[PDB]
């Protein structure tokens, strides 16, 4: 009688075992104990809410608050009057589409005779209708409340959707990640798919309805009825031209693919629309506890209870404390930076920091696609920032004294991420306008310690390697720039502060002065320095300039410290010193190491090893003439378009440290050899497309120019030199696309493909794809990637790559078993429902039944616990388990598949989870909750912005947090979960498909052709004892390193190292001598543990 008294006019009885028509709306939802929405019980929600928005006094009375938001002024009130009238016309469209549905094929006539038309996949909206004469009609309270949710969704959906990477697009389309076309990713994130639009809209509808789900009701109605309403509202928005629908066909690019995907984009409002200063008036008027809002002053966001998009995992108490500290920081608006942005204008901002205007008649088709994506990011960030400024400006007359708070949540890899799309932590344009840092300095004397901090901040913003030089040397470098190239730019900024105007050629002045140092952070350095020059009182200068403590190769260094076992080697000691770990050198900073000891970082070290491997490969095939020519063509092509590859006049090959940046970072991230090859080739094709645009530009200026000079005009001193380069380009492309190398029996053989490149090119629409693209990747994989991966292994160590292999095998095997049991357990439950008369196919399972299936998997240890963090590698949301349609609209379109939260195969995702989660993720968690933690800082991943008044103390604390995170044992945590899984697993109950996947990870190629169940089980237990041996070695190494004196300078910006107060002196020793001393303590620790066990 609870919900049966609020909606007594609904069609059908509320009994699950009735005879006629049953109402599944009242059987699936229940009234809450305390109210959550103010529209429950009303008769005209679209009229009561519109009345409350007509005045400030009425808004306060309806909301029951002392005062309303100051931004809710008269201009905003007028704009909401038109929006409410627009929402009344949306309801008229919905009411007219229902009458057509009941008229075609006599649906209404049959439904009134007893036919269960409300249980259809498209008739699920018949559970919220009422009888009216001989026909049916909507329920006014339920219909008008859903319209209000659509209006709020239309205003803020874009600024809340997630960002799709290349991996996500590949899964949706089905095309291989390494063969994704040009601009496909940039097209996908512009709009949203059907599933994303409907699911997000349906979430708001349920919230506004203010009801609670029934745990014993089928998932086909608790999730289908809200979804069926969302699809109808989205269809109405398309008819009203509020949402534009675009259809992309995969058969155009891949004829073998028959998938069709629709994309929906919301039409955006004007940048001067007064509604942009307060777009959450409807949300705060309906919900008792609004979710979308901006926090001012003492308004502190609440702490989330579960991980991001991982509802099965809850934040640990240690993780919740870190979130609370990060949400207490106050942000402030820098007025001089804001006025500079609006004076320059959006057009000049795009011209300076973007691609500017585009003339598509002189651009390549593929080149123009990338330029538009660059412009979109800058333009969207500019619009988002100035909408916030409008809201802040209404709170007080002084915009610089309004504190701002931001919400945080935990990423599945243990990373604190700001909520929203464009915020200081994500957008660089917004980062320079809203700052949490402040300082007061005495700059009346140039020899003060305060002036040295001021110079350090300016130098780092102007692209100067401050962590590789001493303070005195850095000061000399900055002085030359200030009085040299940057002088014209400073003069313009000085006039701007006093007057407030800019010249018509301001873009050209900044472009010439900055050059290769152009960035958003470099603009603030010019303004801050110019403001200091005109300050009347330099002894109390207040500035928001900061210094960023950036880690030196944070990724690779963490891996070699956390997942390395065995005895110490001199090579490890030398290579780990480049990361900031010094043994036997008290109070040694990174600036001293680079200046005197070693000036090569990890990126340069791997480049040198790559040259060594490349020379050995050529010498192996010295007698093979066809193989030698193929290697020459690959290097020749990369020399023409990549600045990191250079060939001398004598044929000597020279490489730069910039060729191993990306490969080294993604190698630690578990990416395979094919992934590196695909990215390397993509860099070459981008340069080729850009060179085609120069051909079109040169032809327009001079139609009589030659083809060679139109291409390599600026890369050749004479015309004859230009003709030489053109011949090289044509020959290399034909050679690299005609034959490919095939690795058989351990040797490489050239095999023809028959799909070589022929004909005359067209600069406007030149494209490389199909079999031509695959031929290029085959040559790159076997001739350049293989030598590259050998050099990387030599630097990081052979033991580190051994730990990654066992970790990948252990996680993949566990995920395969979990996925098979989940699918095998929901099919047995469905077979039981077939004997239930009150059950129909399409209702799926129940939330109570789904929770029992997941609880039965607890004896296999699906989650990894480290004591302060939790990880769930196999968790995902997929529609494979349900394999059925959830709901459609009244036109039998917009079919939405049903997706549930079920485990899935891991693959190579195990390595990134533990390298990042226990690496920089744990370091930043400690830094926010440690004793005497730094205050007023912005914590970007592997970085931290610090004010000029606390650079020394905060840098020392950052190095202390790094040392704490190096005492962990990620392998031991994985071993403990894997040992429990092996105790309870039963391989004899696995499907034949599952047994084939496990054999691909535990056995060799020859051993898995006819392997039995016993062979697979025996091979899986071997991995268990491999993890135990690795984990024991890591534990001993950390114990030994804690007994000696160490200096930690991983955050090398300032030069404030941290000492571990060890009591063993290893100074005045070579790395060869230190390894022997460390190995002596390693053998003593092993003996004690074995002796203790014996006792």
Curated annotation (Swiss-Prot):
Disulphide bridges, residue numbers: none
Subcellular location: Virion
Residues of the full protein shown: 1007 to 2101 of 3500
Keyword Electron transport attached: no
UniProt family annotation: Belongs to the phage and mitochondrial RNA polymerase family.
Gene Ontology cellular-component terms listed: DNA-directed RNA polymerase complex; virion component
Key words of the record: ATP-binding, Coiled coil, DNA-directed RNA polymerase, GTP-binding, Magnesium, Manganese, Metal-binding, Nucleotide-binding, Nucleotidyltransferase, Transcription, Transferase, Virion
Stated name of the protein: Virion DNA-directed RNA polymerase
Positions annotated to bind ATP: 428-431, 550-555, 661-662
């Amino acid at each position: 009688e609870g919900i049966d008294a609020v909606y007594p006019s609904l069609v059908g009885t509320a009994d699950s075992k009735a005879e006629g028509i049953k109402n599944y709306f009242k059987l699936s939802f229940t009234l809450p104990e305390e109210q959550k929405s103010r529209t429950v019980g009303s008769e005209a929600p679209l009229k009561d809410v519109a009345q409350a928005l007509s005045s400030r006094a009425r808004y306060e009375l309806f909301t029951e608050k002392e005062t309303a938001n100051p931004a809710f002024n008269g201009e905003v009130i007028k704009r909401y009057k038109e929006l409410m009238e627009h929402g009344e016309g949306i309801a008229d469209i919905l009411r007219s589409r229902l009458a057509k549905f009941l008229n075609t094929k006599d649906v209404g006539k049959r439904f009134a005779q007893g036919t269960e038309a409300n249980r259809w996949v498209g008739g699920k909206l018949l559970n919220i209708v009422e009888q009216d004469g001989d026909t049916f009609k909507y329920n006014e309270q339920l219909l008008q409340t859903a319209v209000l949710a659509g209006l709020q969704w239309r205003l803020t959906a874009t600024s809340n959707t997630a960002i799709k990477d290349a991996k996500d697009v590949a899964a949706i389309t089905g095309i291989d990640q390494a063969l994704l076309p040009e601009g496909l990713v940039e097209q996908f994130d512009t709009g949203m798919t059907l599933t994303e639009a409907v699911s997000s809209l349906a979430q708001k509808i349920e919230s506004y309805w203010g009801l609670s789900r029934n745990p014993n009701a089928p998932l086909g109605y608790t999730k289908g009825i809200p979804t069926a309403m969302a699809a109808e509202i989205l269809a109405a928005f398309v008819e009203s031209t509020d949402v534009v629908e675009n259809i992309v066909d995969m058969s155009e690019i891949d004829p073998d693919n028959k998938k069709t995907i629709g994309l929906y984009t919301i039409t955006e409002l004007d940048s001067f629309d007064p509604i942009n200063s307060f777009p959450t008036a409807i949300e705060e008027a309906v919900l008792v506890n609004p979710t979308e809002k901006m926090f001012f002053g003492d308004d502190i966001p609440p702490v989330a209870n579960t991980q991001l998009r991982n509802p099965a995992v809850r934040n640990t108490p240690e993780q919740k404390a870190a979130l609370k500290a990060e949400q207490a920081t106050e942000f402030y608006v820098h007025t001089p930076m804001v006025q500079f942005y609006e004076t320059l204008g959006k057009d000049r901002i795009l011209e300076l920091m973007g691609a500017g205007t585009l003339n598509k008649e002189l651009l390549n088709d593929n080149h123009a696609k990338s330029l538009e994506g660059k412009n979109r990011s800058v333009e969207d960030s500019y619009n988002q920032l100035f909408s916030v400024i409008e809201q802040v400006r209404a709170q007080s007359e002084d915009i610089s004294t309004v504190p701002i708070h931001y919400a945080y949540n935990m990423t599945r890899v243990g990373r604190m991420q700001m909520l929203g799309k464009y915020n200081p932590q994500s957008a660089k344009l917004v980062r320079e306008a809203i700052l949490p840092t402040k300082a007061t300095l005495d700059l009346s004397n140039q020899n003060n310690e305060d002036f040295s901090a001021f110079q350090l901040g300016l130098a780092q913003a102007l692209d100067i390697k401050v962590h590789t030089m001493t303070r005195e040397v850095m000061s000399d470098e900055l002085t030359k720039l200030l009085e040299g190239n940057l002088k014209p730019a400073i003069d313009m900024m000085v006039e701007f502060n006093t007057t407030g105007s800019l010249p018509e050629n301001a873009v050209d002045v900044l472009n010439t002065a900055l050059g290769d140092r152009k960035s958003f952070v470099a603009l603030m350095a010019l303004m801050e320095y110019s403001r200091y020059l005109v300050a009347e009182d330099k002894s109390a200068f207040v500035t928001p300039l900061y210094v960023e403590a950036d880690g030196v190769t944070n990724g690779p260094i963490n891996a070699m410290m956390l997942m390395t076992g065995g005895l110490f080697t001199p090579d490890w000691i030398r290579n780990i010193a480049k990361g900031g770990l010094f043994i036997g050198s008290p109070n040694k900073t990174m600036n001293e190491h680079r200046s005197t000891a070693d000036n090569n970082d990890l990126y340069q070290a791997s480049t040198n090893a790559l040259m060594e491997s490349l020379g050995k490969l050529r010498s192996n095939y010295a007698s093979n003439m066809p193989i030698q020519s193929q290697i020459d063509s690959l290097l020749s092509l990369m020399d023409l378009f990549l600045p990191d590859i250079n060939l001398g006049e004598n044929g000597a090959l020279e490489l730069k440290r910039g060729i191993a940046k990306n490969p080294l970072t993604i190698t630690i991230y578990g990416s395979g050899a094919r992934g590196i090859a695909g990215k390397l080739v993509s860099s070459v094709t981008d340069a080729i497309y850009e060179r085609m645009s120069d051909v079109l530009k040169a032809r327009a200026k001079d139609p009589n120019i030659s083809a060679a000079m139109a291409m390599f005009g600026k890369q050749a001193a004479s015309e004859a030199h230009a003709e030489e380069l053109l011949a090289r380009f044509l020959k290399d492309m034909e050679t690299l696309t005609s034959t490919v190398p095939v690795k058989r029996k351990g040797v490489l053989e050239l095999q023809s493909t028959g799909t070589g490149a022929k004909g005359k090119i067209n600069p406007k629409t030149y494209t490389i794809k199909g079999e031509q693209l695959k031929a290029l990747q085959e040559n790159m994989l076997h001739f350049f990637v293989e030598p590259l991966r050998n050099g990387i292994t030599q630097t990081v160590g052979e033991s580190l790559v051994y730990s990654t292999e066992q970790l990948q095998k252990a996680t993949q095997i566990q995920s395969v078993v979990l996925e098979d049991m989940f699918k095998q357990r929901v099919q047995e439950k469905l077979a039981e429902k077939a004997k239930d008369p009150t059950w129909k196919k399409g209702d799926f399972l129940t939330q109570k039944e789904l929770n029992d299936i997941q609880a039965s998997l607890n004896n296999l240890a699906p989650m990894i616990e480290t004591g302060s963090q939790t990880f769930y590698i196999a968790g995902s949301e997929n529609a494979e388990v349900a394999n059925q349609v959830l709901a459609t609209n009244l036109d039998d379109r917009m079919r939405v598949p049903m997706s549930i939260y079920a485990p899935a195969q891991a693959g190579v995702a195990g390595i990134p989870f533990m390298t990042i989660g226990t690496g920089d993720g744990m370091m930043m968690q400690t830094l926010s909750t440690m004793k005497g933690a730094p205050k007023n800082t912005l914590k970007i991943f592997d970085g931290m912005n610090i004010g000029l008044n606390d650079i020394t103390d905060a840098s020392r604390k950052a190095n202390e947090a790094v040392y704490t995170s190096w005492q962990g044992n990620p392998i031991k945590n994985v071993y403990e979960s894997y040992a429990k899984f092996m105790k309870n697993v039963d391989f004899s109950k696995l499907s034949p498909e599952a047994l084939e996947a496990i054999g691909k990870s535990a056995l060799e190629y020859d051993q898995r052709e006819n392997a039995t169940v016993d062979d697979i089980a025996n091979a899986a237990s071997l991995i268990e004892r491999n993890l135990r041996n690795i984990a024991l070695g890591v534990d001993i190494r950390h114990k030994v390193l804690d007994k000696v004196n160490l200096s930690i300078d991983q955050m090398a910006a300032v030069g404030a190292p941290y000492q571990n107060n060890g009591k063993i002196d290893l100074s005045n020793m070579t790395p060869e001598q230190q390894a022997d001393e460390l190995n002596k303590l390693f053998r003593e620790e092993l003996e004690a543990r074995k002796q203790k066990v014996a006792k």
